[PDB]
Enzyme design. Structure first.
Site, PDB file in Angstrom:
ATOM      1  N   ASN A  46       0.965  -1.085   0.319  1.00 16.69           N
ATOM      2  CA  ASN A  46       0.234   0.015   0.133  1.00 16.69           C
ATOM      3  C   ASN A  46       1.022   1.186  -0.114  1.00 16.69           C
ATOM      4  O   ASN A  46       1.941   1.861   1.525  1.00 16.69           O
ATOM      5  CB  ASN A  46      -1.037   0.441   1.463  1.00 16.69           C
ATOM      6  CG  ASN A  46      -2.124  -1.176   1.447  1.00 16.69           C
ATOM      7  OD1 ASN A  46      -2.830  -1.842   0.667  1.00 16.69           O
ATOM      8  ND2 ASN A  46      -1.625  -2.419   1.800  1.00 16.69           N
ATOM      9  N   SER A  51       2.545   0.534   3.949  1.00 16.77           N
ATOM     10  CA  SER A  51       2.527  -0.679   4.581  1.00 16.77           C
ATOM     11  C   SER A  51       2.422  -2.032   3.801  1.00 16.77           C
ATOM     12  O   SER A  51       2.422  -1.712   2.420  1.00 16.77           O
ATOM     13  CB  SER A  51       1.096  -0.785   5.568  1.00 16.77           C
ATOM     14  OG  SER A  51      -0.229  -0.568   4.712  1.00 16.77           O
ATOM     15  N   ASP A  53       0.517  -6.270   3.147  1.00 11.74           N
ATOM     16  CA  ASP A  53      -0.204  -7.057   4.056  1.00 11.74           C
ATOM     17  C   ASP A  53       0.196  -8.669   2.901  1.00 11.74           C
ATOM     18  O   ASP A  53       0.413  -8.563   2.018  1.00 11.74           O
ATOM     19  CB  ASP A  53      -2.228  -7.172   2.925  1.00 11.74           C
ATOM     20  CG  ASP A  53      -2.727  -5.199   3.291  1.00 11.74           C
ATOM     21  OD1 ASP A  53      -2.666  -5.475   4.446  1.00 11.74           O
ATOM     22  OD2 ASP A  53      -3.590  -5.042   2.269  1.00 11.74           O
ATOM     23  N   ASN A  60      -2.086  -6.877   7.791  1.00 11.94           N
ATOM     24  CA  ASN A  60      -1.372  -5.591   7.746  1.00 11.94           C
ATOM     25  C   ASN A  60       0.032  -5.201   8.118  1.00 11.94           C
ATOM     26  O   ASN A  60      -0.023  -5.319   9.780  1.00 11.94           O
ATOM     27  CB  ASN A  60      -2.418  -4.732   7.712  1.00 11.94           C
ATOM     28  CG  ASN A  60      -1.435  -3.209   7.580  1.00 11.94           C
ATOM     29  OD1 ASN A  60      -0.782  -2.201   7.656  1.00 11.94           O
ATOM     30  ND2 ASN A  60      -1.530  -3.189   5.528  1.00 11.94           N
TER      31      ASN A  60
END
Length: 130
Positions: A46, A51, A53, A60
């Site tokens: 992201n 971050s 996943d 996350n």
């Protein structure tokens, strides 16, 4: 590793996910299906909050595991995000349990809200012997 539907359904059952915090196996199956397509090495970066996943449940890095590169992140599962990319999913399940122990429960994952909540999840465990 990419699980086949019923293979995953039994692996999760054995790990005690059936009804964990009131969440059925079918909901967990619906979550993993939409999050990763049952692939334990699935990852998503992201760019907005830097971050990532990780794994079958796409957990996350800002809050659940440490990967050392997510700014100001915590590590609630006390795991290296690497543990979330193993073929063996026991650590990811221990972390998914930690996640639902919080206020939101299964709703912690927006994809669950989108494709599982108030939808028919029965189909995810049919024929699996669970």
């Amino acid at each position: 590793k990419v699980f086949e539907r019923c293979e995953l359904a039994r692996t999760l059952k054995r790990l005690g996910m059936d009804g964990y915090r009131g969440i059925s196996l079918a909901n967990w199956m619906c979550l993993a299906k939409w999050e990763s397509g049952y692939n334990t090495r699935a990852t998503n970066y992201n760019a907005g909050d830097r971050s990532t996943d990780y794994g079958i449940f796409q957990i996350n890095s800002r809050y659940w595991c440490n990967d050392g590169k997510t700014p100001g992140a915590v590590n609630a599962c006390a795991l290296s995000c690497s543990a979330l990319l193993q073929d063996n999913i026991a650590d990811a399940v221990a972390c998914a349990k930690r996640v639902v122990r919080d206020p939101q429960g299964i709703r912690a994952w927006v994809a669950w809200r989108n494709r599982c909540q108030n939808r028919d999840v029965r189909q995810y465990v049919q024929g699996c012997g669970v």
